Amino acid sequence: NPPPPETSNPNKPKRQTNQLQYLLRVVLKTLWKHQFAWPFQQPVDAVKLNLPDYYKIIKTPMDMGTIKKRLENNYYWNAQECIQDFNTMFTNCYIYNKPGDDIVLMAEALEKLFLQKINELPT
Ligand SMILES: COc1ccc2c(c1)C=C1c3c(ccc(OC)c3O2)C(=O)N1C
């Protein structure tokens, strides 16, 4: 396994915004409880899951456990930065797999719920 994505970085500028607060309290914590959330709650363990090709294909890994810790650590500058991490997580799934796979059906449903929840954010 590669090292997991960082969740802290002292020289990176931090910020707390209403939208980032909402992304943790509402968006992530709601997605987390979905029946299809479990494959996305932690970095992919290529050794445990027997996916030796995973990090040969996926060069910008991301998962909701990392995102949750980044939100809790006020790692992001703005909501768009966190939204980009969700989008990276979803697109990684589509890239590593192919249409119709169970894991892709799961990501497709989670992506639709995610878009529903970020359609309107606080001001
Ligand atoms: C307990 O956490 C788990 C357990 C098994 C899981 C995953 C995470 C997450 C996966 C995953 C993918 C592809 C194949 C796969 O299994 C063949 C798979 O399995 C994939 O793209 N992601 C994100």
Name the resolution in angstroms.
Answer: 1.6
For ligand 1, atom 5, name the residue with the nearest CA: 39
The CB of 103 under 6 Å from ligand 1? The reply is: yes
The CB of 104 under 6 Å from ligand 1? The reply is: no
CA distances from 109 to 32, 33, 59, 90, 102 (A): 13, 13, 24, 10, 11
The CB of 4 under 6 Å from ligand 1? The reply is: no
CATH of domain 17-121: 1.20.920.10
Atom of ligand 1 nearest to the CA of 93: 21
Q: Where are the domains of the chain?
A: 17-121
Could you tell me which of 5, 4, 7 has the C-alpha nearest to residue 73?
Answer: 7
Give the determination technique.
X-ray
DSSP for 7-69, written as a single string: S--TTS-----HHHHHIIIIIIHHHTTSTT-GGGSS---TTTTT-TTHHHH-SS---HHHHHH
In angstroms, the CA 28 to CA 30 distance is 5
| Cα–ligand 1 centroid distance for 121 (angstroms) | 30
For ligand 1, atom 12, name the residue with the nearest CA: 103
> Amino acid identity of 112?
K
| Cα–ligand 1 centroid distance for 5 (angstroms) | 17
